[PDB]
């Protein structure tokens, strides 16, 4: 089975430098470009760069320039990132990941916990949280500044984040379900303008679920949904 294998925690101090590891297997390490991807509670989910390890050639996005450093071990077939110059704002947990729908693969993510006692598309998202009750119906909208549609196709998907496990594809292209994402879920729109729906929702359905655009680099995401069961 093909997996993504990150380490739980680092706790550094401000100032040091951390190696994350992404120990991959059950695919040809080489073949696939990989992605590290920041999430923090209020700006969702960052793209941070990604490698093709096969050649080590890499991007960044502007942002993470000189914070972040891609490398690639093909005889242990590991990606690391180095984050450098560690400070409070880099305190956030991060994902290795296969971006691209079609090869969704996210690890659990690795959480930095820098410690010391003393014209990109956005993408908002709303409402940010929200309770809805066992059968009922939770619809969550994400609009883009800018349209993430081409050729008649929105490149546009909205990913899960169940408690404790890691991120997921749930709907790629707008209206797609993902393999094995049960038929409750739907997605529409076009353009600049999208929406999620739930129905009936059920106990399991309880989740971050974020947008994401990968129609222009660099490739963004909304801030995330909050979706808990109203107990009643
Ligand atoms: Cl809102
Ligand atoms: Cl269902
Ligand atoms: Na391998
Ligand atoms: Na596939």
């Known amino acids: 089975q093909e997996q993504l294998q990150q380490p739980g925690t680092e706790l550094v101090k401000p100032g040091a430098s951390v190696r994350l590891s992404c120990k991959t297997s059950?695919?040809?390490?080489?073949?696939?470009?990989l992605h590290w991807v920041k999430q923090t509670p209020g700006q969702g989910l960052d793209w941070i760069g990604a490698?093709?390890?096969?050649?080590?050639?890499?991007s960044y996005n502007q942002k993470f320039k000189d914070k972040a450093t891609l490398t690639a071990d093909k005889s242990s077939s590991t990606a690391y990132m180095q984050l450098s110059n560690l400070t409070s704002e880099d305190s956030a947990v991060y994902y290795c990941?296969?971006?691209?729908?079609?090869?969704?693969?996210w690890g659990a993510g690795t959480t930095v916990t820098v410690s010391a006692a003393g014209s990109d598309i956005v993408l908002t998202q709303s409402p940010t949280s929200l309770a809805v009750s066992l059968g009922q119906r939770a619809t969550i909208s994400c609009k883009a500044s800018?349209?993430?549609?081409?050729?008649?196709?929105?490149?546009m998907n909205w990913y899960q984040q169940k408690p404790g496990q890691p991120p997921r594809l749930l709907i790629y292209?707008?209206?797609n379900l993902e393999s094995g994402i049960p038929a409750r879920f739907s997605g529409s729109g076009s353009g600049t303008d999208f929406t999620l729906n739930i129905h009936p929702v059920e106990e399991e359905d309880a989740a971050t679920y974020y947008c994401?655009?990968?129609?222009?680099?660099?490739?963004?995401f909304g801030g995330g949904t909050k979706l808990e069961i109203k107990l009643e």
């Open positions: 059950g695919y040809t390490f080489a073949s696939y470009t």
């Open positions: 292209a707008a209206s």
């Open positions: 994401q655009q990968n129609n222009e680099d660099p490739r963004t």
């Open positions: 800018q349209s993430v549609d081409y050729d008649g196709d929105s490149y």
């Open positions: 990941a296969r971006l691209d729908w079609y090869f969704d693969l």
């Open positions: 490698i093709y390890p096969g050649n080590g050639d890499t």
